[PDB]
C-alpha cells in the first residue's frame, strides 16, 4: 500500500528479524483493519487514545484527524509488532525481499541488525532502503509465510545459511579463543546475556588463583535445551559443548556446523534465537578489552624489506624483460610474483593485530595488504587491457627519460615501492593508469551482465516444478527435466517443492557472479567472466571467429 | 490420494492462512478456543496447528486431471 525510503544504520542489541522505524515515518503511514468481533474493545481503546488516523463506514471516507460497530474499516498508525518488507533498490539485489517486525524510535534512520547486511548486500556508508507496507490480509499472509527470516534461513542459490558471523563477532570469538579462561566477575557479566544458566566452573580451585570458566561454557549459553548433535570439529551433548577442536582456519565452519545442527533438530526459530543470544554476548565480551592497530603493524623490518627488494632485483626484473616480449600464454610472471608475495605475507603475519583483522585464506584480501606493506608489483602490460600498446611504448620511453639517474635499473611496469613508504611521481603515474583502467572497466563494463540478465529472464521465466514433479515449461507445456534433484520424491521432501520458480532462481544464480566479477575487475575475475561468456553466449549461426 | 506429495507446500499454506483469516474477519465462528488473542492471522495459525480447519484442495496435474484432498490430511508437522 505505502512505501518509504530511508538511510540505514545498524543496531546489534535488537533481534535479527526486527527493524526500527523513525517516528516521522511511522505516524503518517496507516494499516487498515476490518472491525468485527474479538477486536471491538481493543480497537475502541485505540480510537479513544487517538491512535487511529482515519475511518470509512460503507464508502464515504469520514476523517478523524465515533463509536465502533462491526463492519467498517479503521486506519490506524504503525505500532510495535507489525510486519513490513524491506528491499534495497534491486539494481543487482535480485533476491533480497525480506519480511521484518517493526519497532518505533525517535531518530531519522532505519535500524537493522548487522547480520542482515549480507542478505541485503548493504553497508552503512550512505545506503538507503525501501520499506513496503502490506495492507490486504492475504498479502500479509503471503509476506509472513514466504519471506520471513526463519523461512528463508537456508539459501536457495547455495546450500549454506544466509546468516554468517561477520566482522566484530568473529574477531570477538578469535580473541575469546586465544585466551581460554575467564574469572568469576566477567563470566557472570557475560552470563547475564545468555538464555540458559551459567554452569559450574570448569576449574574450581587452583592454589594460584580462584575459579575459572572456559570459553566453551560461555559459548554454550546460547543453546536450546536438550540439544545433542554432531559435526566435523565439534560434539554437543545434553545442551553442553563437549568438544571443539583448535583452529582459526576452521572456526567459522565449526560455527556454521553448530547452527546447521540446531536447525536440523531444534525447533521453529531456534537458530535465530541462538544468534539473538550469541551476538550481544560477543559485543559485551570485546568491549572491556578494545582492539586497535598501530604503525608497528604496518612497518616491515629493514631485513625483510631488503629480502623483498633482493628477490625482486634478482628474480623478477630479468625475467620480465624476457617473457613479456613473448605473447599472452606466458603467465609465469604471475606465479613468480605470487611466490614473492607469499614470502611477503609470511613476513607480515607476525604482527598480532593484522592476522585477526583479515581472512588469512582469502587471496584477494591478502594481495591488498602486500601492496601496502611491500611492493605493488606489475602495473603496466599490453595484454587484454583497455588501453593500447602505444601508451605502453610511450611509458617505457618516458621511463628512460625521467630516471636519468641509471636508467633500466629494473623494469618500467614493475613498481617496487609500497603505499606505506610512498610512491615516486613515475610510480604514481604508472599506478594511476592501472587504477583508471580498473575504474573504467567497472563502470562502463556493466552492460554485458545487464544484457545477459535480460536475455536470461526472457527465456527462463516460465519454468516451474509441476504438481507431478516434472520440471516443465508452462507456456508450451513441455518437459525440460524429469526431476529437479536426484533424491526428491513423494516420501522425502526436499529443499525445493512443487510450484517453485526454478528458472528465475537459475537466472539469478547465474547473474550474481557476473556482476561480482565485473564489479571487482581483477585479472582472475576478468578471465572467469570471459570463460562464462564463451559458454552462455554461443551463436547458432557460424561466425568463423 | 496417491501420486503427489504428502507434505503441504508453502504456497498452499499461505493461501489457506489468508482465506482463513479473511473468513474470521467476516464474523465467522472460530473452531477452537482463544487464549487471549486478537490478530486473526494468529487465530488461523492456531487453527492450522490444531488441524481444526475445514477446507478442501484440488491439485491440478498438467495433463488436465486433478486430485481432491482434504486439508487435514497433509503433513504440516515439521520442526527444525
Amino acid at each position: 500500500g505505502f512505501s518509504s525510503r530511508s538511510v540505514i544504520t545498524g543496531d546489534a542489541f535488537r533481534n535479527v528479524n526486527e527493524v526500527g522505524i523513525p517516528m516521522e515515518i511511522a505516524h503518517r503511514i496507516t494499516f487498515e483493519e476490518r472491525v468485527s468481533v474479538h477486536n471491538i474493545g481493543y480497537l475502541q481503546e485505540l480510537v479513544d487514545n487517538k491512535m487511529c488516523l482515519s475511518y470509512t463506514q460503507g464508502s464515504t471516507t469520514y476523517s478523524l484527524r465515533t463509536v465502533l460497530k462491526p463492519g467498517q474499516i479503521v486506519h490506524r498508525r504503525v505500532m510495535d509488532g507489525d510486519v513490513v518488507f524491506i528491499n534495497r533498490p534491486p539494481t543487482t539485489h535480485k533476491h533480497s525481499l525480506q519480511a521484518l517486525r517493526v519497532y518505533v524510535h525517535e531518530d531519522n534512520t532505519v535500524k537493522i541488525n548487522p547480520l542482515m547486511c549480507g542478505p541485503l548486500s548493504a553497508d552503512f556508508d550512505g545506503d538507503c532502503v525501501h520499506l513496503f507496507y502490506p495492507q490486504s490480509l492475504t498479502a500479509k499472509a503471503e509476506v509472513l509465510e514466504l519471506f520471513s527470516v526463519d523461512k528463508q534461513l537456508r539459501s536457495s542459490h547455495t546450500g549454506q545459511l544466509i546468516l554468517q558471523l561477520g566482522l566484530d563477532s568473529l574477531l570477538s570469538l578469535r580473541v575469546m579463543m586465544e585466551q581460554v579462561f575467564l574469572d568469576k566477575a566477567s563470566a557472570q557479566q557475560l552470563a547475564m546475556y545468555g538464555s540458559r544458566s551459567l554452569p559450574s566452573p570448569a576449574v574450581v580451585k587452583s592454589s594460584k588463583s580462584g575459579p575459572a570458566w572456559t570459553f566453551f561454557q560461555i559459548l554454550q549459553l546460547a543453546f536450546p535445551e536438550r540439544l545433542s548433535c554432531r559435526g566435523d570439529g565439534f560434539i554437543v551433548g545434553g545442551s553442553d559443548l563437549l568438544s571443539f577442536d583448535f583452529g582459526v582456519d576452521a572456526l567459522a565452519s565449526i560455527i556454521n556446523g553448530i547452527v546447521t545442527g540446531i536447525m536440523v533438530e531444534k525447533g521453529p526459530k531456534e537458530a535465530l534465537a541462538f544468534f539473538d543470544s550469541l551476538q550481544p554476548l560477543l559485543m559485551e565480551h570485546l568491549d572491556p578489552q578494545g582492539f586497535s592497530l598501530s604503525l608497528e603493524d604496518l612497518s616491515m623490518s629493514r631485513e625483510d624489506m631488503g629480502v623483498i627488494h633482493n628477490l625482486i632485483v634478482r628474480e623478477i626484473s630479468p625475467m620480465v624483460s624476457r617473457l613479456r616480449l613473448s605473447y599472452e600464454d606466458e603467465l609465469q610472471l604471475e606465479n613468480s610474483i605470487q611466490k614473492v608475495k607469499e614470502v611477503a605475507a609470511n613476513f607480515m603475519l607476525k604482527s598480532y593485530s593484522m592476522r585477526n583483522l583479515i581472512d588469512i585464506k582469502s587471496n584477494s584480501a591478502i594481495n591488498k595488504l602486500v601492496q601496502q606493506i611491500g611492493f605493488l608489483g606489475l602495473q603496466l602490460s599490453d595484454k587484454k587491457k583497455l588501453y593500447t600498446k602505444t601508451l605502453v611504448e610511450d611509458m617505457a620511453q618516458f621511463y628512460k627519460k625521467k630516471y636519468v639517474s641509471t636508467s633500466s635499473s629494473g623494469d618500467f611496469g614493475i613498481v617496487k615501492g609500497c603505499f606505506f613508504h610512498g610512491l615516486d611521481p613515475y610510480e604514481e603515474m604508472a599506478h594511476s593508469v592501472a587504477a583508471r583502467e580498473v575504474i573504467v572497466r567497472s563502470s562502463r563494463g556493466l552492460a554485458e551482465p545487464g544484457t545477459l540478465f535480460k536475455n536470461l529472464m526472457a527465456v527462463l521465466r516460465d519454468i516451474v516444478i509441476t504438481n507431478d514433479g516434472t520440471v516443465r515449461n508452462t507456456c508450451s507445456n513441455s518437459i525440460v527435466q524429469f526431476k529437479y534433484e536426484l533424491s526428491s520424491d513423494n516420501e522425502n521432501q526436499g529443499l525445493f517443492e512443487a510450484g517453485d520458480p526454478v528458472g528465475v532462481l537459475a537466472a539469478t544464480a547465474m547473474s550474481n557472479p557476473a556482476y561480482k566479477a565485473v564489479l571487482d575487475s581483477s585479472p582472475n575475475s576478468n578471465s572467469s567472466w570471459e570463460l562464462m561468456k564463451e559458454v552462455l553466449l554461443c551463436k547458432v549461426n557460424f561466425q568463423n571467429t | 490420494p496417491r501420486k503427489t506429495s504428502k507434505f503441504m507446500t508453502k504456497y498452499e499454506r499461505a493461501r489457506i492462512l489468508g482465506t482463513r483469516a479473511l473468513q474470521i474477519s467476516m464474523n465467522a465462528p472460530v473452531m477452537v478456543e482463544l487464549e487471549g488473542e486478537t490478530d486473526p492471522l494468529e487465530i488461523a495459525m492456531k487453527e492450522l496447528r490444531q488441524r481444526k480447519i475445514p477446507f478442501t484442495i484440488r491439485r491440478y496435474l498438467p495433463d488436465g486431471s486433478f486430485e481432491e484432498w482434504g486439508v487435514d490430511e497433509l503433513i504440516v508437522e515439521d520442526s527444525w
Binding site: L537, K539, V540, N541 | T19, F55, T56, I57, Y60
Partner: peptide, 24 residues
C-alpha cells in the same frame, strides 16, 4: 545461446493455477 540469434531460433521452432480451495 542467450542472445537474439538463439532466442529467435527457438521462438521460431516452438502457485497460480496449481491448486484451488473450496469449502467442505
Amino acid at each position: 545461446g542467450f542472445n537474439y540469434g538463439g532466442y529467435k531460433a527457438l521462438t521460431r521452432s516452438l502457485t497460480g493455477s496449481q491448486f484451488e480451495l473450496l469449502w467442505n
